[PDB]
Curated annotation (Swiss-Prot), chain A:
Pfam families cross-referenced by the UniProt entry: TetR_C_5, TetR_N
Keyword terms: DNA-binding, Plasmid, Repressor, Transcription, Transcription regulation
Domain HTH tetR-type: 1-58
Lineage: Bacteria, Bacillati, Bacillota, Bacilli, Bacillales
Single GO BP term: negative regulation of DNA-templated transcription
GO function term, MF aspect, one: DNA-binding transcription factor activity
PROSITE patterns on file: HTH_TETR_1 (PS01081), HTH_TETR_2 (PS50977)
Protein name per the record: HTH-type transcriptional regulator QacR
Function statement: Transcriptional repressor of qacA. Binds to IR1, an unusually long 28 bp operator, which is located downstream from the qacA promoter and overlaps its transcription start site. QacR is induced from its IR1 site by binding to one of many structurally dissimilar cationic lipophilic compounds, which are also substrates of QacA.
Residue ranges the UniProt entry marks as DNA-binding: 21-40
Keyword Transcription regulation: yes
SUPFAM superfamilies noted in UniProt: Homeodomain-like (SSF46689), Tetracyclin repressor-like, C-terminal domain (SSF48498)
Length: 180, 186
């Protein structure tokens, strides 16, 4: 089970959903095509299970890291820097978008997105309560921030990590200064 | 037209079935050609696709050339460029092929280098906006290169990762973004 999950995740990250075949998982995970079945049934269910684990791991990791930022302003900076460095969830976004632009309401996938946006919602709601900013539509600002940061993460993979952190911090500064 | 008919047919098939499901045997049979000849003009399925994107990219640039004339200030041009990126990607028939292609070859240094040259033309559009804006006194931005990359990546994140099917709400979110972003530059 655990060899199929690890190799699957890696191939999905490296090649996306379509280019990863159950045969290719079978060959590199030392297990039968019927071994993948029963444990996972289908390629889709294996991927969705990988996403469940990834988003739980990401959410665990953020629970621990957010104590390090005292203000919600600092938490926005921190969360966005961590999205670039984390091994969890963010590395799969290209596989996730592809899977999303193919699959049949499994879409009920939207509770995976709402979780990923909810970190910003807490940040922005709590910042509202602690007088750090005034935001009337937190739901909208949360979605905008999350998807914007996701674009900065996902579309700058080619680059040096220090420069990516520098671009991201400038984004965070512009964005927060724009809530003024 | 060996090369041009393969381009047209490949485009149709990429629209119809996406990048991954479309094979070179299909492209060549419907073009009345051969895989040896496809290999000759484009070497790979990957490079054939990249050539289509370059022709399409050129069409997008000429559209923006004539559409930006209706936005008086560079501030208005920023809002418009972002809304156009969104609405165009929403109906664009090659969009799914582009996503499939990108999500497969984004970590391949060979292809991913050529993807960057395409992407940089988008960032250049933003650079012109922000530079012209500096000159016109609409804002004062020190690193126009950084800000242009940030805008381009941020706008396309909003377009790609947003799941709201309602195009009205998507447009509203993008215009809010443009407002926040520009307000942050002051
Ligand atoms: C048809 N059409 C107008 C467009 C089509 C595609 C793009 C994209 C993109 C993403 C990031 C970019 N950056 C960071 C410069 C540039 C382009 C893009 C979206 C999803 C997957 C790959 C690329 C934009 C416009």
């Amino acid at each position: 089970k655990d060899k199929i999950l690890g190799v699957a995740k890696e191939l999905f990250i490296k090649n996306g959903y379509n280019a990863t075949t159950t045969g290719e998982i079978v060959k590199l995970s030392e297990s039968s095509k019927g071994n993948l079945y029963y444990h996972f049934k289908t390629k889709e269910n294996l991927f969705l299970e990988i996403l469940n684990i990834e988003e739980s791991k990401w959410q665990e990791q953020w629970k621990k890291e957010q104590i390090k930022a005292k203000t919600n302003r600092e938490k926005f900076y921190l969360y966005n820097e961590l999205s670039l460095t984390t091994q969890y969830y963010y590395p799969l976004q290209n596989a996730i978008i592809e899977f999303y632009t193919e699959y049949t309401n499994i879409n009920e996938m939207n509770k995976l997105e709402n979780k990923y946006i909810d970190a910003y919602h807490v940040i922005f709601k709590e910042g509202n309560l602690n007088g750090e900013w005034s935001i009337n539509d937190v739901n909208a600002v949360s979605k905008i921030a999350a998807n914007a940061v996701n674009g900065i993460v996902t579309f700058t993979h080619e680059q040096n990590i220090n420069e990516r952190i520098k671009l991201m911090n400038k984004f965070s500064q512009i964005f927060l200064n724009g809530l003024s």
